[PDB]
Design a protein around this ligand. Sequence first.
Ligand code: COA
Ligand code: COA
Ligand code: COA
Ligand code: COA
Ligand code: K
Ligand code: K
Lengths: 489, 489, 6, 6
Amino acid sequence: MKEIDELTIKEYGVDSRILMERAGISVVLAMEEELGNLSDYRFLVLCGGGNNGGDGFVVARNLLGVVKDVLVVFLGKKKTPDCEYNYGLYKKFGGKVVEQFEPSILNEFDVVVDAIFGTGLRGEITGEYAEIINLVNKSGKVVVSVDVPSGIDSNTGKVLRTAVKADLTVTFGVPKIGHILFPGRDLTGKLKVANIGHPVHLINSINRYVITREMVRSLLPERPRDSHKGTYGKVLIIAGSRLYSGAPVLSGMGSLKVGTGLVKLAVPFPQNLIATSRFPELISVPIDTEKGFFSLQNLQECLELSKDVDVVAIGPGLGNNEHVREFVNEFLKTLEKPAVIDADAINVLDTSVLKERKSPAVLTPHPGEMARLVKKTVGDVKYNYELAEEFAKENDCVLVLKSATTIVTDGEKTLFNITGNTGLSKGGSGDVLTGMIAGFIAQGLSPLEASTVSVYLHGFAAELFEQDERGLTASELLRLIPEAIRRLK
Amino acid sequence: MKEIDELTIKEYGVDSRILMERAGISVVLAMEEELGNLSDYRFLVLCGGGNNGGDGFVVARNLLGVVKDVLVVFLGKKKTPDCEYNYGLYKKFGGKVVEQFEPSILNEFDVVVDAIFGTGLRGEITGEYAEIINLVNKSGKVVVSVDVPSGIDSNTGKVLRTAVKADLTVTFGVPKIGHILFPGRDLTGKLKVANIGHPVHLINSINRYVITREMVRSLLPERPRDSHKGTYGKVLIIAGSRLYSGAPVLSGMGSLKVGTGLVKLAVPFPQNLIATSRFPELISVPIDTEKGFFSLQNLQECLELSKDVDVVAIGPGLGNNEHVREFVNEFLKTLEKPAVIDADAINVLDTSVLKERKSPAVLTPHPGEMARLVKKTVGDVKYNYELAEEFAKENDCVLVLKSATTIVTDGEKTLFNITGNTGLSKGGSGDVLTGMIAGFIAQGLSPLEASTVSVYLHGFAAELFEQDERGLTASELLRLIPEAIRRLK
Amino acid sequence: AWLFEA
Amino acid sequence: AWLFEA
Ligand SMILES: CC(C)(COP(=O)(O)OP(=O)(O)OC[C@H]1O[C@@H](n2cnc3c(N)ncnc32)[C@H](O)[C@@H]1OP(=O)(O)O)[C@@H](O)C(=O)NCCC(=O)NCCS
Ligand SMILES: CC(C)(COP(=O)(O)OP(=O)(O)OC[C@H]1O[C@@H](n2cnc3c(N)ncnc32)[C@H](O)[C@@H]1OP(=O)(O)O)[C@@H](O)C(=O)NCCC(=O)NCCS
Ligand SMILES: CC(C)(COP(=O)(O)OP(=O)(O)OC[C@H]1O[C@@H](n2cnc3c(N)ncnc32)[C@H](O)[C@@H]1OP(=O)(O)O)[C@@H](O)C(=O)NCCC(=O)NCCS
Ligand SMILES: CC(C)(COP(=O)(O)OP(=O)(O)OC[C@H]1O[C@@H](n2cnc3c(N)ncnc32)[C@H](O)[C@@H]1OP(=O)(O)O)[C@@H](O)C(=O)NCCC(=O)NCCS
Ligand SMILES: [K+]
Ligand SMILES: [K+]
């Protein structure tokens, strides 16, 4: 968007002052939408010397004569030209500016407008900026942040030593990565994205996206009336072990609940019988194993089972030992079908295999699994969308990096999912999503499309749970999938 | 407001381009508020070469990429600098402009945005501008006018040969006289007044006002609990004749229904008995007249009746003959109380008397009565607020010039009333308003305040009638006054 | 009412 | 939605 503002001024010829005026009035309107009538409130506007501060002076000026009181505290040592222009207007209109933040000043105001730093912040916040931000956060006032809460790195969502906790953030043109990834997402509060007059073509030239309800609705496959089960695809799920007998069942029902026609599971005997006792609509093939885990002796049978399906999911509950590792890698190297690779299949995966496959794959790691896959620390991979993009491009796959905000990428397009809640931070949730992705691929969506629709619907289903989210289990999530689909439509 | 825009740019330093951008975005938001989601509509924007047209280019540009279709027809031979600037932006953003209005083009659009002429129009519209405006008015499309419907004289509300009939008019800063007086008021449709960033001090330096609910609520007098009838004033109404026996009754009840403490009527016997048969709370004093009309022989009695009141109303139903003329003028010259002068008292009034009175007066003519009073034609006085102001200043009075839009002025402040409906175009309505004004003066409001509150409440009462307005009568209006007061509070 | 008087 | 995506 730094690019976007510059082209809009330099190539399109929109005066920088017009963009700044539109930015500020949009904050005023946003506030009115959340607070109702503004005339009873007293506003403290905290302005930096940059263009975020300039936007703050526009806000402040537009409140003059209309609200109970407005004061600007200017916290800068110099002003960008647009900030200087809007400072001068604020003062010409009769506005009061002070240059020293006295901690008790907070007592006399209802709303704090945070226009200290925007996307221009670089480096840790120190000194008196930090003391001020901390005082605002302890004040209990309503906080409205201009563009991004001050102290959030707009490219990453990390806190730069400290940051404002906003009730309402008003950003311009498009959301920033820092609104979408945590901790930034938490500090943003309610986000409104304001149209401030950039050409719609430039706004739409962005290559990273938030997954929206309208996007998912347009990707949901068609259900032709004259269909039969094969119309809706066939999935094989290779999953489970004597240790982990539940995973197959959750993956399988995840495929069925999204509309897949036929789902079969290959599960070590007698753990395969667990699935049909719970959901007799599943096909749960018994696999004769030596000690309760898949091994190379099961390679040929699993390849034969794969011949008559559209997609294969592998990994949930397989276990991780050397014999599973041999099986997984040899299977994936030979399988000429799309694969969804999760859990223990990721843990044992040789990435060389991904490079040599002709068929597509989707990988669904959490950050612990991603860290192991690229031999890095969890902190180095968590919310690292550039790493994810590089990995997907280098390995010719779709990568679905699960977290509260889920990143989906094929290395060219990257999508961020914000549906869900903490009830999904519980064993079994990932197994459901794996089945969902395979099911949608089986119905004819591309690996990327299937991943996009699935992460959104999985999170939206969680949110439809009727009692406290901490009590949500994967079994209940399964029941909520068709409701999420209905509500989406 | 020509003044207002210039000071805002030249003294306050707001770039003219910023004001024009704010004007245009305000039209977009106004449209969304009335049409809902704009994305399904096709917009035809008609732009002149002036700043109204410039505002139109801002509207058009802001719709690009967001609605079904936008086309501008540019109808000018040259462009003001701001219009030229916004034309260039419109084109840079990919907007289509044609310079010839083909009559069938209307078929392909849902909404016409009228940005041809604003407050800059001078003189009759001829030629192809007129043909275009007439085609828009025959088209049945939704019409949104920028600032004022093109063809209305913004200072007077007259049609300059022809004018656009708008469904929605969006004006900037303040309403214009042309929105408020007819025929302009009719052609405006629904009016929204947008804040486009003028300093609130300049907006409030205007000396003419629309009478609003908030103004009337703040002027309504207090009702202290420990009161008695005298707290709320005493009114004498000198009214009626053998020809016109109903007028006194309507005036008297008009005073009582607005909260006046005591109302007495002086009416020629036996017509005085009509009043108490209908409303026995009135005092209706019998006056012994020679032939059924007040004359000089009743002067002394009426002066004695005036000693114990706060205000005297005179005129409704008196009749107009030489003996009434002698009485009225001698009475008013001698009466040292505020007077409300209506109807036949206006018809016989010698304005020299107004100049020589020490006490205040309010006059309540309709345009026929005003025309007779200043010896002009009805067309010369109707909606002539400058004449009204001159008359009030020269005669030291408040003038209430009744019409669908009522003008109230003391020569320094002028207020326009827009409440009411056509049920008030019926005999008896004016007699009620006279009593209302006297009553409010008796309660302690200034002549100007009393006139302001009364015209608003009188019109608002009419609008509360539950059946078709053409069936409203003065008797029913009386019943609705206390409801208007309640609703106002 | 910040933007419009109606 | 002309002004805001929420
Ligand atoms: C203009 C833009 C290209 C980036 O620069 P910017 O907007 O001026 O940047 P900000 O207002 O966020 O902040 C800049 C100021 O932050 C402060 N700053 C940055 N890091 C800091 C640090 N860690 N410690 C203290 N101060 C710091 C400084 O005051 C800095 O200027 P300085 O380093 O010369 O002193 C653009 O991305 C932007 O933020 N504008 C967004 C769009 C907008 O606001 N709409 C229209 C108006 S142009
Ligand atoms: C399943 C079992 C292996 C536990 O493993 P697990 O918690 O699922 O471990 P995972 O590979 O899935 O990785 C979890 C890690 O990923 C990372 N992680 C996952 N999601 C994350 C996210 N959103 N953000 C940050 N970190 C995340 C964390 O480091 C997490 O560690 P933590 O749980 O300590 O915080 C174990 O309980 C079991 O079922 N069998 C026991 C068998 C055994 O080993 N011993 C007996 C022999 S039979
Ligand atoms: C600028 C202002 C001082 C008055 O001038 P203006 O706005 O340019 O005037 P308009 O757009 O209404 O119209 C001017 C044009 O109307 C047309 N015109 C006027 N009378 C005409 C006639 N009867 N026949 C044909 N054309 C006529 C002309 O095209 C004229 O320019 P021209 O005579 O040189 O050809 C101001 O009062 C105004 O209309 N702006 C309102 C505020 C606003 O729009 N907000 C901010 C933007 S500045
Ligand atoms: C009352 C009586 C005099 C009729 O008069 P009226 O209609 O009330 O006349 P007004 O002085 O009030 O003036 C009305 C004129 O004012 C003007 N007028 C009033 N309000 C107006 C407005 N809002 N806009 C424009 N014009 C307006 C019009 O010219 C109107 O004329 P119109 O009714 O022909 O359109 C008559 O019917 C009567 O009651 N008595 C008859 C006695 C008589 O003269 N002859 C018999 C002898 S006893
Ligand atoms: K900020
Ligand atoms: K217009």
